[PDB]
């Protein structure tokens, strides 16, 4: 049961505190942008919502549809202030 969530983070000194994989023309194929790891002690982890496997659909309303890996990183890293991520998330959680 895949659901849409809005997750709001304040950057720490280490950024949003997660990594991404995927992207149009990515080494794995033409993929959406997926959260891979949520780092211990970072903003995404302290917030407690974002998780491995979440697909980042938008960043402060700016769509990631069809973007390359590098495009997604630029949007994620340059977007100013409080960051609201629109994500598509699964019911299941990896452990």
From Swiss-Prot:
Tissue specificity remark: Expressed in heart, brain, placenta, liver, skeletal muscle, kidney and pancreas.
Subcellular location: Cell membrane; Apical cell membrane; Postsynaptic density; Cell projection, Dendrite
Disulfide bonds: none
Every PDZ domain range: 6-89
Top-level division of the source organism's lineage: Eukaryota
Domain notes: The PDZ domain 1 binds NG2. The PDZ domains 7 and 10 bind the Ad9 E4-ORF1 oncoprotein. The PDZ domain 9 binds F11R. The PDZ domain 10 binds the C-terminus of CLDN1 and KIT and the C-terminal PDZ-binding motif of HTR2C. The PDZ domain 13 binds CXADR. The PDZ domain 2 binds CAMK2A and CAMK2B. The PDZ domains 10 and 13 bind PLEKHA1 and PLEKHA2. The PDZ domain 13 binds SYNGAP1.
Main function: Member of the NMDAR signaling complex that may play a role in control of AMPAR potentiation and synaptic plasticity in excitatory synapses. Promotes clustering of HT2RC at the cell surface.
Subunit structure: Interacts with CLDN5, DLG4, GRIN1, F11R/JAM, CLDN1, NG2, CRB1, MPP4 and PALS1. Interacts with HTR2A, HTR2B, HTR2C, PLEKHA1/TAPP1, PLEKHA2/TAPP2, CXADR, SYNGAP1, CAMK2A and CAMK2B. Interacts with FAT4 (via cytoplasmic domain). Interacts with DLL1.
Disorder association: Hydrocephalus, congenital, 2, with or without brain or eye anomalies: A form of congenital hydrocephalus, a disease characterized by onset in utero of enlarged ventricles due to accumulation of ventricular cerebrospinal fluid. HYC2 affected individuals have variable neurologic impairment. Some individuals have other brain abnormalities, including lissencephaly, thinning of the corpus callosum, and neuronal heterotopia. Most patients have delayed motor development and some have delayed intellectual development and/or seizures.
Protein name: Multiple PDZ domain protein
Protein's organism: Homo sapiens
Organism placement in taxonomy: Eukaryota, Metazoa, Chordata, Craniata, Vertebrata
Portion of the parent chain present: 1982 to 2070 of 2070
């Amino acid at each position: 049961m895949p659901q849409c969530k809005s997750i709001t983070l304040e950057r720490g000194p280490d950024g949003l505190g997660f990594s991404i994989v995927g992207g149009y023309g990515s080494p794995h194929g033409d993929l959406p942008i997926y959260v891979k790891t949520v780092f211990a002690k970072g903003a995404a982890s302290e917030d407690g919502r974002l998780k491995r496997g979440d697909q980042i659909i938008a960043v402060n309303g700016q769509s990631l549809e069809g973007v390359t890996h590098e495009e997604a990183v630029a949007i994620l890293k340059r977007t100013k202030g409080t960051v609201t991520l629109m994500v598509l998330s699964s019911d299941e959680t990896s452990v």
